[PDB]
């Protein structure tokens, strides 16, 4: 908890070098939770869908071959639709915040691509002679 | 089951290219991978020249050959062809076509009978 | 000599049988218990996936959701009974007249007018009150004086004068890791292999419909009248048939009802039955002789299909027991009904009006040691249902072709669901598995 | 839910291709749970559940070495007495399940030699001269 | 369970072999639970921290770039004042448990140090020309 939201204001470039100080704040009495089991079931809940939300991005960062990065790329090509602008525009002098409300509609396209790409990578590795 | 069927000159004369072509019966070029070229040199035995993925026109040919191979192929045609560029009388050989499967799952060859080519 | 070198998958699809416990999802659209324990909704369009080339083996009388919904619909109906008005106080002597003013002779003795002394609010003070009741609940100390029928044997409280237990289509669905696999064969026997199978998120809507001998409201078949069994020789066990025509039966109570509302403690009512307006008259039933008489001819056919070619079928009424044994034991518009069938079964093989009794304190099937009081409905009120299936019983077995004899039977709650959850099967995914290939690392 | 088993009356060699449809759905009120707390326990149970069972699937997968992989090989031989047959006899013509059925009895014994072989692995990678 | 803590008493250069034994281990009635709900908490209380810790630990070795590994090597010195010994003192001749006790006040360094050299080396890998 040293900045868990500080790059908020920053250009997307400049925020990237703060991934791990938001990743790591993400997955953070004795006898009043069994004495009035009402609250024992509302903290249960509380932490059961921590875990859950977790889990899901780690299975899309598995499938999309990404599993352990925490920046990764693709073979997956830009569309010019999704956001007509060049890297100089996106890197620099805008927020993520403002980037996500930008291409908000798209995130389903983009993640079934990603989905796509990795399930044909597979299938070129069952083939000794693959990429020649 | 694929028939791998070649021709060309069988004669070159030195400093001049070398070409040959391999048509493709019972299946198709442009969906499977491994077409390619091995020659027989007498004295040396049999030598890798290269091959093509017909699903990309990527190709990877033997180092010794990278200054002079071309392998590409003709998808009207499903034939596919080998190119040299100027050869000498160092590559008189029996020049074959071929098809190399090899995934996980299978294993195969198919090769066809060759063409004889002499460089004088 | 293959040399091949045991590669891992993940993701393969394989399959096992498993027990989970299923939840409840409804349609949203759905005061009724059922509309508040089945709050999620489903998919308005089911992901339903045809699995080709799949044969596989289901068995409907080892079917555990049947054994779930069996829990559900109890464990509801011991909650919502929670927070509601006992009526420990009522039970008390009482002083009791024949109530035999407008009445018609077939209901002569049917209901009693009884007074008693009963508190008020206050510790120190009481009222005399009266009501009217059904003899059914009302039994003879030692001859005006009565006791409530069941105070020598259980605790009896008021039904929540709120909450409705009118059926909802409600749909079971799998827990993540599960999945539901249903059969769309045709003609299925309720074991075996079928051949046409798909994969589903939850089951079809099923209305927790509970009924004796006859079944009430739910599928009708499809293609002909199906007789299912779990052995059908021994005679010891049920048949389920099942109709590809509905009967339509109507139901009334012809007595108009009002309520009176009496204070039993600080903040407590009780709903007492009032006077009758008008003349006093037998509940009852009625069923197209017309659609009823033909109905059977073809449950006959089937029947036979399993006995012989040139036997004799006979239908019989109903043996001894309690009145949710021997009736017809039907729920609707928030009263108990305990409608006679013999006039249904009462032919051989080779408009029916049917009189009811109604009853209020209401020892559920379901166990004993507590029972439900139902409040009086005001007003009039009339049922319409679909007869969809019966509940056979083979009462012979015995060494002689030349005929065979059955009867209404069942009773048990779970012969109302086991019908709709007939067509369906859990199973639990595994997906690691490995295979060899020609490839290390 | 695309397919969540539309593979199972394939081949295992073609099956091989919906991996992920597969993987992506394996880990897919308001007062009334604690008004009625006996639900709010039967609800977490099943979560809890969910939970466990991807956890201890993708334990196995990190031991074995094949983490963050749908396909993977290992250096274990197969056995002729698990399965005599040859590699024409199980991709083509063989579903998962009757393959699973065949093999069943063996699969701990796989799974042990899947686990010794990775700790070998591990044991030449602490010797800088290794595999020469 | 064959050595769930066999190696023990092991020096740390020998208990380096028994890594799946312990990992193995550490993510291991009908209506009683449910008719008497305090315990349907009690035992849900403990399925959740079990896989909470789990994956604590987890999410450390992916930040710390040692993802899917028992043994894993960084880039970060080993400073002389954390335990002033050398590797003939640590590997023979010494416990786990010794080493632990050694070193605890040091943890917290540590683990910065290693978060830390993580991501300079993710800042690294977008410079097409980096370590030249
Ligand atoms: C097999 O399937 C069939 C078909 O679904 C099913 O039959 C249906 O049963 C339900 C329940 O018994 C019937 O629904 C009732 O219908 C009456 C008819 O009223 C009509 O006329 C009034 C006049 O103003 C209209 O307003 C009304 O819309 C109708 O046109 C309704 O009156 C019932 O509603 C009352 O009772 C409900 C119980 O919870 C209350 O929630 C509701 O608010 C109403 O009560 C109010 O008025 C009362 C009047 O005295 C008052 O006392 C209450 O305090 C409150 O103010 C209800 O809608 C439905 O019609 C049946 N369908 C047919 C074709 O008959 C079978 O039962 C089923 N078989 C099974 C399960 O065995
Ligand atoms: C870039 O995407 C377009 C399609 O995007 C459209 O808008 C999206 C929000 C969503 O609604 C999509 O479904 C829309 O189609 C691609 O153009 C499509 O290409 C296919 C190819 O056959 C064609 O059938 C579609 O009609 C095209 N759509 C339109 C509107 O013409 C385009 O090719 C993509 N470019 C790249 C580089 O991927
Ligand atoms: C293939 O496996 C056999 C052993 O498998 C047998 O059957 C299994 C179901 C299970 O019961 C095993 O425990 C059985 O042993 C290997 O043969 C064994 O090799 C060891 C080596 O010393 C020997 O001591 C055993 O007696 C052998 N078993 C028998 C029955 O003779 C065989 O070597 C394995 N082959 C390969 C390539 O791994
Ligand atoms: C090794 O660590 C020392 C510092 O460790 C000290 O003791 C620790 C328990 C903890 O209290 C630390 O905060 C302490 O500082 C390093 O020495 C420091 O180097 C910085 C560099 O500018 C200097 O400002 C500090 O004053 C130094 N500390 C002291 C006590 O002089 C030392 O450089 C480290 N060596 C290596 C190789 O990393
Ligand atoms: C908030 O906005 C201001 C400017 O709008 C940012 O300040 C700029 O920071 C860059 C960093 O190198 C400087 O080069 C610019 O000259 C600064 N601009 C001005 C006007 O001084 C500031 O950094 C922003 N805050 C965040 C968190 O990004
Ligand atoms: C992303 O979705 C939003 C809505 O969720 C789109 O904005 C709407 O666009 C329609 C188009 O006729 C307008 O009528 C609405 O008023 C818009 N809503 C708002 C809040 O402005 C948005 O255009 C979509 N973006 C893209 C790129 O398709
Ligand atoms: C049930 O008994 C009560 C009396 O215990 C009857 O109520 C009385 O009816 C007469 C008729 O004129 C009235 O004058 C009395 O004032 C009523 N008494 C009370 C206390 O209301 C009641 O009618 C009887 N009900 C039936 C159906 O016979
Ligand atoms: C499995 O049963 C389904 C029944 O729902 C069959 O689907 C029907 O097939 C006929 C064939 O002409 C169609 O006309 C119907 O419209 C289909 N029904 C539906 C609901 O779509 C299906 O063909 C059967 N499959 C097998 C293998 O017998
Ligand atoms: C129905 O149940 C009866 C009773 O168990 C089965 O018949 C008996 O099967 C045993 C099997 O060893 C025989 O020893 C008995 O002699 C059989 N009884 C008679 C009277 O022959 C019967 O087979 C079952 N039928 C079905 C269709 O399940
Ligand atoms: C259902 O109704 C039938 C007739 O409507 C009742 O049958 C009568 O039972 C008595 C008992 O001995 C016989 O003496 C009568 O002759 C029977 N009548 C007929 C027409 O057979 C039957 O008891 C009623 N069932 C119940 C449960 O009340
Ligand atoms: C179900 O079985 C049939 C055949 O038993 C499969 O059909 C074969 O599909 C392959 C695919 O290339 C064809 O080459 C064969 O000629 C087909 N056979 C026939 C007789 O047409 C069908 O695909 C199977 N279904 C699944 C899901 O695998
Ligand atoms: C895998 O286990 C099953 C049992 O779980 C084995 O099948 C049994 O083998 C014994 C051997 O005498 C028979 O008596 C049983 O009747 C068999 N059971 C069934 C259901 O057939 C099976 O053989 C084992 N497979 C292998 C390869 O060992
Ligand atoms: C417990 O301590 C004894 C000695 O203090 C260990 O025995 C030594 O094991 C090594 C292993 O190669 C031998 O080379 C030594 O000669 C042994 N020492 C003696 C005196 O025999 C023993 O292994 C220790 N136990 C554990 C679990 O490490
Ligand atoms: C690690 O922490 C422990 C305490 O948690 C340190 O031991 C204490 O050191 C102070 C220093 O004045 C002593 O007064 C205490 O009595 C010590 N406690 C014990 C239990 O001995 C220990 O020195 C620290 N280690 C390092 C390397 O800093
Ligand atoms: C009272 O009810 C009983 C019920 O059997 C009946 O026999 C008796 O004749 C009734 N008394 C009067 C006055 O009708
Ligand atoms: C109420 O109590 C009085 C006390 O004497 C008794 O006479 C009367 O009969 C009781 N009333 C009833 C209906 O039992
Ligand atoms: C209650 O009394 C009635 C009177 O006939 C009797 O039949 C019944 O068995 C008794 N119940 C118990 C539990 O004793
Ligand atoms: C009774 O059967 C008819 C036949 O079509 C059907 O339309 C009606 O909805 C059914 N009623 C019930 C309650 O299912
Ligand atoms: C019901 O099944 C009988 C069986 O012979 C058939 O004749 C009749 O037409 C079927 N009814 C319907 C509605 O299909
Ligand atoms: C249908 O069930 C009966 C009762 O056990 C059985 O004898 C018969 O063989 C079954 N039919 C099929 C097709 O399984
Ligand atoms: C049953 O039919 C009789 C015939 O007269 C009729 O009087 C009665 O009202 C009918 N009952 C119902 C429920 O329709
Ligand atoms: C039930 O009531 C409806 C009301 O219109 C009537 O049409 C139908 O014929 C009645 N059914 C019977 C069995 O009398
Ligand atoms: C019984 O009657 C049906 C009528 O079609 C016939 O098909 C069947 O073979 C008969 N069975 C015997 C045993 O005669
Ligand atoms: C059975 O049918 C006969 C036919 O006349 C009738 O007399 C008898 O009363 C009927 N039985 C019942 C219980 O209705
Ligand atoms: C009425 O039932 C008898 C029973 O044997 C049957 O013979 C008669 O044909 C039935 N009536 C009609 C209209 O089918
Ligand atoms: C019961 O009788 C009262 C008397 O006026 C009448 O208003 C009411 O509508 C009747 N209720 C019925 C027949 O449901």
């Known amino acids: 908890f040293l900045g868990f939201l500080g790059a908020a204001g920053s250009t997307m470039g400049a925020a990237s070098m703060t991934l791990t100080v938001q990743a790591r704040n993400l997955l953070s009495c004795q006898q009043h939770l069994l004495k009035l089991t009402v609250w024992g079931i509302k903290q249960l809940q509380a932490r059961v869908l921590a875990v859950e939300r977790y889990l899901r991005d780690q299975q899309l960062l598995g499938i999309w071959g990404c599993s352990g990065k925490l920046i990764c790329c693709t073979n997956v090509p830009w569309n010019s639709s999704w956001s007509n602008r060049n890297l100089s525009e996106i890197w620099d002098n805008m927020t993520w915040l403002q980037w996500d409300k930008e291409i908000s509609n798209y995130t389903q396209i983009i993640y079934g691509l990603l989905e796509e790409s990795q399930n044909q990578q597979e299938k070129n590795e069952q083939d000794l002679l693959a990429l020649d | 089951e694929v028939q791998l069927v070649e021709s060309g000159p069988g004669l070159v004369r030195p400093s001049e290219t070398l070409s040959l072509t391999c048509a493709v019966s019972?299946?198709?070029?442009?969906?499977?991978?491994?077409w390619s070229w091995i020659r027989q040199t007498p004295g040396k035995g049999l030598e890798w020249i290269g091959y093509?993925?017909?699903?990309?026109?990527?190709?990877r040919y033997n180092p010794s050959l990278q200054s002079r191979v071309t392998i590409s192929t003709d998808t009207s045609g499903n034939q596919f062809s080998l190119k040299v560029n100027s050869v000498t009388a160092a590559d008189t050989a029996k020049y074959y076509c071929?098809?190399?499967?090899?995934?996980?799952?299978?294993?195969?060859?198919?090769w066809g009978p060759g063409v004889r080519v002499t460089v004088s | 000599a293959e040399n091949l070198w045991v590669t891992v998958y993940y993701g393969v699809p394989v399959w096992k049988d498993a027990e989970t416990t299923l939840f409840c999802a409804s349609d949203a659209k759905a005061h009724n218990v059922w509309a508040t324990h089945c709050c999620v909704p489903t998919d308005p369009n089911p992901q339903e996936i045809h699995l080709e080339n799949v044969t596989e083996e289901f068995n409907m009388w080892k079917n555990n959701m049947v054994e779930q919904m069996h829990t559900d619909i109890i464990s509801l109906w011991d909650q919502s009974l929670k927070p509601c008005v006992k009526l420990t106080p009522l039970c008390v002597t009482l002083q009791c007249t024949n109530v035999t003013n407008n009445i018609t002779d077939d209901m002569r003795g049917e209901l009693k007018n009884c007074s008693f002394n009963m508190t008020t609010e206050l510790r120190d003070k009481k009222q005399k009150v009266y009501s009217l009741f059904y003899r059914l609940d009302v039994v003879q100390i030692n001859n005006k004086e009565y006791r409530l029928i069941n105070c020598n044997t259980s605790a009896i409280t008021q039904a929540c004068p709120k909450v409705s237990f009118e059926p909802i289509p409600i749909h079971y669905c799998a827990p993540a890791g599960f999945a539901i696999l249903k059969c769309k064969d045709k003609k299925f026997n309720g074991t075996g292999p079928c051949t046409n199978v798909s994969t589903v998120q939850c089951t079809h809507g099923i209305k927790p419909v509970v009924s004796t001998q006859l079944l009430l409201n739910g599928s009708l078949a499809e293609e002909e009248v199906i007789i299912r069994s779990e052995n059908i020789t021994n005679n010891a066990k049920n048949i389920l048939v099942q109709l590809n025509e509905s009967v339509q039966i109507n139901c009334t109570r012809p007595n108009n009802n009002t309520r009176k509302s009496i204070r039993i403690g600080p903040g407590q009512w009780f709903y007492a039955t009032g006077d009758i307006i008008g003349d006093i008259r037998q509940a009852h039933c009625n069923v197209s002789k017309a659609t009823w008489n033909e109905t059977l001819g073809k449950v006959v056919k089937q029947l036979r299909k399993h006995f012989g070619n040139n036997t004799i079928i006979r239908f019989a009424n109903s043996s001894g027991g309690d009145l949710e044994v021997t009736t017809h034991s039907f729920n609707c518009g928030g009263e108990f009904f305990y409608c006679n069938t013999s006039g249904l079964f009462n032919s051989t093989w080779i408009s029916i009006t049917l009189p009811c009794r109604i009853k209020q304190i209401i020892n559920m099937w379901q166990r004993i040691g507590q029972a439900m009081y139902a409040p009086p409905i005001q007003g009039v009120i009339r049922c319409v249902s679909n007869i969809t299936g019966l509940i056979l019983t083979r009462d012979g077995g015995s060494t002689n072709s030349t005929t065979e004899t059955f009867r209404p039977g069942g009773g048990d709650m779970r012969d109302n669901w086991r019908s709709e959850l007939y067509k369906y099967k859990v199973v639990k995914i595994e997906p690691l598995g490995v295979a060899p290939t020609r490839c290390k690392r | 839910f695309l397919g969540f088993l539309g593979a199972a009356g394939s081949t295992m060699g073609a099956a091989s291709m919906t991996l992920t449809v597969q993987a992506r759905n394996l880990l897919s009120c308001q007062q009334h749970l604690l008004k009625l707390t006996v639900w709010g326990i039967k609800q977490l149970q099943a979560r809890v559940l969910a939970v466990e069972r991807y956890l201890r699937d993708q334990q196995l997968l990190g031991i074995w070495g094949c983490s963050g992989k749908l396909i993977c090989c290992t250096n274990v031989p197969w056995n002729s007495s698990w399965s005599n047959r040859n590699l024409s006899e199980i991709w083509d013509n063989m579903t998962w399940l009757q393959w699973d059925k065949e093999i069943s009895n063996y699969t701990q014994i796989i799974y042990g030699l899947l686990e010794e072989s990775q700790n070998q692995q591990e044991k030449n990678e602490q010797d800088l001269l290794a595999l020469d | 369970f064959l050595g769930f803590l066999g190696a023990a008493g092991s020096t740390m250069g020998a208990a380096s072999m028994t890594l799946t034994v312990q990992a193995r281990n550490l993510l291991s009635c009908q209506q009683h639970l449910l008719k008497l709900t305090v315990w349907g908490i009690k035992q849900l209380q403990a399925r959740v921290l079990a896989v909470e810790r789990y994956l604590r630990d987890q999410q450390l070795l992916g930040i710390w770039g040692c993802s899917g590994k028992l043994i894993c090597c960084t880039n970060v010195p080993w400073n002389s004042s954390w335990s002033n010994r050398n590797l003939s003192e640590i590997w023979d001749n010494m416990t786990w448990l010794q080493w632990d006790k050694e070193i605890s006040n040091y943890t917290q360094i540590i683990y910065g140090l290693l978060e830390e050299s993580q991501n300079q080396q993710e800042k690294n890998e977008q410079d097409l020309l980096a370590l030249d």
């Open positions: 093509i993925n017909g699903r990309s026109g990527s190709t």
């Open positions: 071929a098809f190399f499967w090899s995934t996980y799952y299978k294993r195969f060859d198919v």
């Open positions: 019972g299946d198709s070029i442009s969906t499977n991978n491994g």
